[PDB]
Amino acid sequence: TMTLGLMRGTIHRCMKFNQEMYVTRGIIKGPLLKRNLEAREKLNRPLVRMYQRHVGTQLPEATRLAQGTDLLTRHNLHMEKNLKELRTTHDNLAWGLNCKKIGHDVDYDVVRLRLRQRHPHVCYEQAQRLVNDWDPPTPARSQT
Amino acid sequence: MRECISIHVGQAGVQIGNACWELYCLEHGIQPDGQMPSDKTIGGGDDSFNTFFSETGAGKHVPRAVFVDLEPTVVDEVRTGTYRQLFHPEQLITGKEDAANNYARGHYTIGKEIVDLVLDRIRKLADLCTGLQGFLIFHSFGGGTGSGFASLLMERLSVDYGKKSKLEFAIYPAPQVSTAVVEPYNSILTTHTTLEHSDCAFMVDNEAIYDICRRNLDIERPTYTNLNRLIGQIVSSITASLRFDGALNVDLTEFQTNLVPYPRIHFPLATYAPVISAEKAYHEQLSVAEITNACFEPANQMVKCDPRHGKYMACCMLYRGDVVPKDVNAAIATIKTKRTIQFVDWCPTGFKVGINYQPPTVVPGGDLAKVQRAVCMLSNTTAIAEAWARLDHKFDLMYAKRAFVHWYVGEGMEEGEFSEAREDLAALEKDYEEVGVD
Amino acid sequence: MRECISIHVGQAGVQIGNACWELYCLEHGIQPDGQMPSDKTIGGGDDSFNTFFSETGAGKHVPRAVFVDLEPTVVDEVRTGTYRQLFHPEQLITGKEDAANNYARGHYTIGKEIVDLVLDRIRKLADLCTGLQGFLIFHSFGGGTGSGFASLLMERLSVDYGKKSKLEFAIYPAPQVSTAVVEPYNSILTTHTTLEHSDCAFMVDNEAIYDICRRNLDIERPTYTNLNRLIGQIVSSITASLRFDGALNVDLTEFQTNLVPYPRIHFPLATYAPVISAEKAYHEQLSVAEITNACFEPANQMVKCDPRHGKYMACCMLYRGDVVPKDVNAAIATIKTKRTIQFVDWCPTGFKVGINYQPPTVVPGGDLAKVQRAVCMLSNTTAIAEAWARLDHKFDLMYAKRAFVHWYVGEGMEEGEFSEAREDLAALEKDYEEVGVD
Amino acid sequence: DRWKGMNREQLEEIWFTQKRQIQEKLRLQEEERQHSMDWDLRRIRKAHASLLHE
Amino acid sequence: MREIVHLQAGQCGNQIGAKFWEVISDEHGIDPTGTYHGDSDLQLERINVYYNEATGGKYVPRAVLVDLEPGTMDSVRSGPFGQIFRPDNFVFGQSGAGNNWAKGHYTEGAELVDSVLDVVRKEAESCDCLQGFQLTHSLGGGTGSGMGTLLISKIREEYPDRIMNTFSVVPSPKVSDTVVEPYNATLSVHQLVENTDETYCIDNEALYDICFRTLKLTTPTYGDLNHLVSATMSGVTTCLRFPGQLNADLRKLAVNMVPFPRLHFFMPGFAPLTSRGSQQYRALTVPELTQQMFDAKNMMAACDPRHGRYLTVAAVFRGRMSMKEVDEQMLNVQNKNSSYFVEWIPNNVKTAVCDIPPRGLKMSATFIGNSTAIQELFKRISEQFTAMFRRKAFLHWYTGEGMDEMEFTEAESNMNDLVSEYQQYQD
Amino acid sequence: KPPAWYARLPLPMHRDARAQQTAEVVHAHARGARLTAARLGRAQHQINGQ
Amino acid sequence: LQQKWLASKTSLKESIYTTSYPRLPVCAMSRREHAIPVPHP
Ligand SMILES: Nc1nc2c(ncn2[C@@H]2O[C@H](COP(=O)(O)OP(=O)(O)OP(=O)(O)O)[C@@H](O)[C@H]2O)c(=O)[nH]1
Ligand SMILES: Nc1nc2c(ncn2[C@@H]2O[C@H](COP(=O)(O)OP(=O)(O)OP(=O)(O)O)[C@@H](O)[C@H]2O)c(=O)[nH]1
Numbered sequence A: 001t002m003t004l005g006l007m008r009g010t011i012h013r014c015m016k017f018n019q020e021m022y023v024t025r026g027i028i029k030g031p032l033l034k035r036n037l038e039a040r041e042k043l044n045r046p047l048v049r050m051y052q053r054h055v056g057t058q059l060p061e062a063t064r065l066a067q068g069t070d071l072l073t074r075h076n077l078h079m080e081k082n083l084k085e086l087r088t089t090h091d092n093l094a095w096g097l098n099c100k101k102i103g104h105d106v107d108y109d110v111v112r113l114r115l116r117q118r119h120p121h122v123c124y125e126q127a128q129r130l131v132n133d134w135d136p137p138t139p140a141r142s143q144t
Numbered sequence B, C: 001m002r003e004c005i006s007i008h009v010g011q012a013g014v015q016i017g018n019a020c021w022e023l024y025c026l027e028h029g030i031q032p033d034g035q036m037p038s039d040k041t042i043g044g045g046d047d048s049f050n051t052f053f054s055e056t057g058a059g060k061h062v063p064r065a066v067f068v069d070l071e072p073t074v075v076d077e078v079r080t081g082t083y084r085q086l087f088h089p090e091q092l093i094t095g096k097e098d099a100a101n102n103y104a105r106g107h108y109t110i111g112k113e114i115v116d117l118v119l120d121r122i123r124k125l126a127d128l129c130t131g132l133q134g135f136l137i138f139h140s141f142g143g144g145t146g147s148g149f150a151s152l153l154m155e156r157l158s159v160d161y162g163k164k165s166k167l168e169f170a171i172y173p174a175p176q177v178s179t180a181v182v183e184p185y186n187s188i189l190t191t192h193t194t195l196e197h198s199d200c201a202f203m204v205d206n207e208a209i210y211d212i213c214r215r216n217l218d219i220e221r222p223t224y225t226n227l228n229r230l231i232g233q234i235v236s237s238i239t240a241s242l243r244f245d246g247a248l249n250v251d252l253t254e255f256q257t258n259l260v261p262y263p264r265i266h267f268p269l270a271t272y273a274p275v276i277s278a279e280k281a282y283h284e285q286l287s288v289a290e291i292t293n294a295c296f297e298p299a300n301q302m303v304k305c306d307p308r309h310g311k312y313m314a315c316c317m318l319y320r321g322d323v324v325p326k327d328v329n330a331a332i333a334t335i336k337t338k339r340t341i342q343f344v345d346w347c348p349t350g351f352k353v354g355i356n357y358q359p360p361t362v363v364p365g366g367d368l369a370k371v372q373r374a375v376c377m378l379s380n381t382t383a384i385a386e387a388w389a390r391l392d393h394k395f396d397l398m399y400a401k402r403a404f405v406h407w408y409v410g411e412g413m414e415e416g417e418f419s420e421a422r423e424d425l426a427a428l429e430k431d432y433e434e435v436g437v438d
Numbered sequence D: 001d002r003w004k005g006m007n008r009e010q011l012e013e014i015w016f017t018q019k020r021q022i023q024e025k026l027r028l029q030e031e032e033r034q035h036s037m038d039w040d041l042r043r044i045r046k047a048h049a050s051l052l053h054e
Numbered sequence E: 001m002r003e004i005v006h007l008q009a010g011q012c013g014n015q016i017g018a019k020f021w022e023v024i025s026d027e028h029g030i031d032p033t034g035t036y037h038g039d040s041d042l043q044l045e046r047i048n049v050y051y052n053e054a055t056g057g058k059y060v061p062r063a064v065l066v067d068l069e070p071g072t073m074d075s076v077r078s079g080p081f082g083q084i085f086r087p088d089n090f091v092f093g094q095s096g097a098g099n100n101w102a103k104g105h106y107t108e109g110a111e112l113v114d115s116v117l118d119v120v121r122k123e124a125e126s127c128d129c130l131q132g133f134q135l136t137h138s139l140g141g142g143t144g145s146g147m148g149t150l151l152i153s154k155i156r157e158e159y160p161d162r163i164m165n166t167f168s169v170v171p172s173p174k175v176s177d178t179v180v181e182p183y184n185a186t187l188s189v190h191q192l193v194e195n196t197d198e199t200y201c202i203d204n205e206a207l208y209d210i211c212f213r214t215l216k217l218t219t220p221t222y223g224d225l226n227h228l229v230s231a232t233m234s235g236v237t238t239c240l241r242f243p244g245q246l247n248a249d250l251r252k253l254a255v256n257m258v259p260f261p262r263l264h265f266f267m268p269g270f271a272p273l274t275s276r277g278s279q280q281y282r283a284l285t286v287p288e289l290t291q292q293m294f295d296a297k298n299m300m301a302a303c304d305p306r307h308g309r310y311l312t313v314a315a316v317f318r319g320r321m322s323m324k325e326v327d328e329q330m331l332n333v334q335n336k337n338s339s340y341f342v343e344w345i346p347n348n349v350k351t352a353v354c355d356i357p358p359r360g361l362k363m364s365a366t367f368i369g370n371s372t373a374i375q376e377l378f379k380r381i382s383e384q385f386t387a388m389f390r391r392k393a394f395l396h397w398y399t400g401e402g403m404d405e406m407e408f409t410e411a412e413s414n415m416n417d418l419v420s421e422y423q424q425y426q427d
Numbered sequence F: 001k002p003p004a005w006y007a008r009l010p011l012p013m014h015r016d017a018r019a020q021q022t023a024e025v026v027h028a029h030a031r032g033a034r035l036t037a038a039r040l041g042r043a044q045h046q047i048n049g050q
Numbered sequence G: 001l002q003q004k005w006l007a008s009k010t011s012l013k014e015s016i017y018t019t020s021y022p023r024l025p026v027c028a029m030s031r032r033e034h035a036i037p038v039p040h041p
């Protein structure tokens, strides 16, 4: 049970890293609006190409652009593979919790019925009419 | 062309936008039906409305704003009102669950499956627009629903739209009045998330709004009708440059270039000078000199900040109505010669003037006076760090005694994010202090 | 000339063709008796009906369609309907025994003795026709009788006439809803049998058809009447090129050549953009731009696929109504340059436009909108493989524990080409990703 | 090749019939409400008589 | 949409539930027969938070009545509003309680919890998405405590994602009639604080005092006391059903109330209490309201927090008010009374204004209090518990039922922890 | 102040820095060319003299 | 003072929005004398 508290925080921090790296994707794949794109001096600034002029090879800014996009996509795959496993493991722990808890609860109502018949009163017939029904049988069987 | 889109996040921010959109129709010829009289102004949607409303070939003016809310009560109630036929049905973005004042609950639990829908709304509004200077974000710092949902959407609209302007307006937390002790928690959460994305954030406080009401407007028992009206006038004034013309016309882009000195800090202060009762305006006179003194009178600010405890950086004047540059340039020169007025030595000039000849109009069944000469006092001063100063020694207490954390850690946060903001704040005041040092 | 022969297999596929021919009679003004008014359009059968109806010397518009079913109930009901006098009696090929949802029972037990009967109908329809570009096949993958019966026929139709087109239309199985568990059995039997013979197979899924209806048409309780009208309008739109002309006229041959890239995969997806409610159309306006945004909006697709999880190859749009090329070519230029829409780089252009001047009309007793600018979006993407990917993991479990095999082995089968079916399927996904692999 | 589009007269004819369509759609609801509540009234009376017999 | 299903527990809530529901019906204007007289659109539109639609415009109360003694059921059934209640929801047992907590918690509950769980889940599926539940019962009430402790436990694992509101009355401190009542309360409160999230604390002696203080009518009926507590309970529920800018959700309220999970026990405060001449001798002003709202005599819950300090305070204002008066009244009281709050939290006020007045009066309100005034309560029961557990009187019954001393040890030990918990935080 | 900038790799604000990381090279060649523009321009000037 | 004395509302079940924002008279409407007048395109 102490563990059940512990993983949630890990999930809480694990999930947060994911959201802004999708944001980090947007902040590295443009704003996805060509018709506003120009106002930021459309990538290749007019000044750059007229700077080229004599030219003679160009800027490796496209190279880092490709490389940076490649990296973040890789990490995307890594976490998603790791993320999917986590929920599956969590639910197994969640399921195992339920089996453990219910197990003793059904087991619990055993000793108590005994002391209900030690008393100086009570005789034969009260037991047998109630032997077949002391608790609604239905061991709650995850009822829904 | 010259148009924009307004955003109204939080049920607190929807009755204000309601009033603003009520005000806007009171100068655009608008009838509650949705059409003009037989007079010819309808067409492809190109006239004074084309910047504000969308009156297509159907002849019905479609406002360029979206009301988003998460409690159906008010939004359905306003969906049954007088202008609801004008309001586009699902532009009135409603919700069935609240955020429990919890910024994160409004940012993580429900905002995921709702933002995609509103993202569809903005693009279908973005495409129909032509120039779309920017966005008019109406929210609130102490937002039960305004706080969390806005932060995600402003982030989402920032990443896909990172070039156009974004105008932010929120009721600032009352310095001494707190309807909720959870308000500071989310308020700093909003600020730190927005400092690196928000373009121009404008703040306001209701207490001194009320203080004005019984000082010169002389109303001891006003209402939001009055409260919503006056901020609606304020936003109407700043938008008058789009609606009308003047000796010189200015745009929001010039404001951001000239108002904010340095990055991060983008928190100027607005103020409307001719705030007076009708009878007081009746048997008295208005001119540039006294309204200039009034707009620089420290008690006329809706913000609890003493300008003599701070120092000025900017002062933007938007004169709407009949005025001439002569007395304007003469009066401001006297203001420059005033010694109590303490700008920083860094700025020789800090005066942004906008002249508009349209005389501000009254509202039917209104409370304002009869204005011919009006000005909005947009300024930034160093007397504002106390506002962030008061909340930290507020906040540092509760975080040390970690009140209500079980609520927030209950639905999935941790303390690191709360940690980050405090030195982010500690960075803010020292930046305020360092720039305050000349 | 420009005519075709329609085939309606399956008691599922019979109400739809009923509704389609009901729709088709309105635009031609066909009276239920079978004749025009005193207006002069009848003759040797040469006018707008000549492509669809056979209004011969008798003056009665005889549709060029055959309804085939294995249970007499619905067909005996429809032959007691309103237009039963229009319909040819034994063209309504009826049956007395069902296939019990079994594919091979409808393929072996009873189809032998009736295929010769219907083969008489087609050749007697073939002789009266002149150009007969192709055929209209309406079926269902989860065909209790549509699946098995059409399978033998189309094989017999392929062998005798392989020189013309065969157009296939079926309701795609609901990905998570299953009203039958033998449906995966017969469906994969249909797909593999049809892969090497079907010319153009088009699918639809009802769940999103429902999802649209309470999204924009705002009807929480529709019916087949609305469902069949939707698909009936879909087939009506694609047949408007045959009915009326346009700026350019396009034909299924051009559709086939320009839609299927390569062998096997001939399964694009259709979509209709101006699906909106009445009052929403009332106080709003339609134009090319927003319907172009709406047509490519992923939630407007009736098949549960995410285009961002796949990639585009072809897109065919059929503009029915009044449009000008100026806004058309401009809008698509924006669409081609759109970032999110991920076409395969193999195709520089993948756009096939069909202009039709005739505005789409409403049907009396209908619920659609009144569209002046309509479009049907025929497109094929790689985001479809998940459906068959969904299919196989359903099948691989079921088949390993070999449920209901006693039923199929009982009347003359065993598990043999149940195996070849899956690597025929497994061929499909690997081909789908290989073409996905650039 | 020269068709420049429809005229508004058709469009006014267009906008009107939807207004109609909504109206018969509204009564279609309302009449079904009547049809539904009739069944209950039949159920009320038959149940009442059953209690009389009991 | 979000709705509520109610529970009528114990034989006290049998009167309380009867009064609480008829107040709502009279508030919403439905006749006792159930055929609503359409008069107010807003209440017509916000009845679905509590009521479903039956045939012929009849509004079914989505509440459950449970007991063991049929006579109380017959009396409330024969009441003016028994017809609006359903025989489907009348779940009862074939036994007399003896008002034994353990018999109701172990013996008689076992064969009745199955039935009630089916009823509530049927009602749960009858609705879409609840806010949660509220329960009317007593902490010292033998049947209500016995079943409630069982039912609250079972509902927790069933739906740990909703509001488990509890409404229980504290028996008279001076006299308890039931001599084993201190045993019953100690048993229940152990599970209560463990299962509950909210708890309304109400005492009868103060209600008699309030009758003395303002009613001045000598001899009232216990239903009149039920009329008061229903009015208080109705007032807090007015927020959800009615429009007006006040954020209504109990979670919206609870997160404003609970800085630490153990804070479940809350104290009410109500709106103008008026005497025979003062109905027409009163100038109804927010000042004299707010004055009366914070009166040491206006309380009804347990006792004077004058002995302690004020942790969290929240008041809802029902009627035509405005932000300025409630603001300045808060300023007035904050300056009037600064030091007697805790320095742990300032600005401890939560303000809500319901613009819709009640029926009969215009300017009204309701207050909920969480102050350090529960220490007197459980310390009182401590000496009673220790004295009776000093010599184990009346213990053979529970041993006969299947009870032994061990469970009391942690029951009081947890209780002793809360005593130190309440003290040490404030002290 | 702890030393933080080492390499890692995540760069939430990266395009903007790279944009100014174009600013040095774009101006760099401009300075060198004007030096040549200096020597060529006067050269012809006094050349036209004689 | 005399008329207000009654202080007895007729329609107490009124939302402020209805009271605060009713339909305003048509003849009280502003005219656009100079609001960037561009009849020409
Ligand atoms: N903007 C605005 N604020 C108001 C008005 N009246 C009161 N307020 C204050 O504004 C705050 C609104 O914030 P929230 O309550 O969090 O609003 P929300 O996030 O949309 O969610 P709710 O709690 O349901 O309203 C309240 O705390 C009030 O103090 C008003 O008319 N407009
Ligand atoms: N095409 C069509 N399909 C429908 C209609 N209504 C329901 N359906 C779906 O279509 C399927 C019908 O296919 P089958 O049951 O195999 O039809 P069949 O082979 O002609 O013979 P039957 O089993 O007797 O109906 C059902 O599983 C439904 O899910 C409808 O009006 N038209």
Ligand SMILES: Nc1nc2c(ncn2[C@@H]2O[C@H](COP(=O)(O)OP(=O)(O)OP(=O)(O)O)[C@@H](O)[C@H]2O)c(=O)[nH]1
Pocket: E009, E010, E011, E012, E013, E014, E015, E016, E097, E098, E099, E137, E138, E140, E141, E142, E143, E144, E145, E146, E177, E178, E222
């Ligand atoms: N209904 C009702 N209850 C009262 C009244 N006066 C005091 N009570 C108390 O309310 C408590 C709660 O009722 P229940 O929980 O239903 O009673 P119980 O479980 O059978 O156990 P008892 O306390 O012995 O009655 C009882 O313990 C009574 O002491 C009254 O006038 N009417």
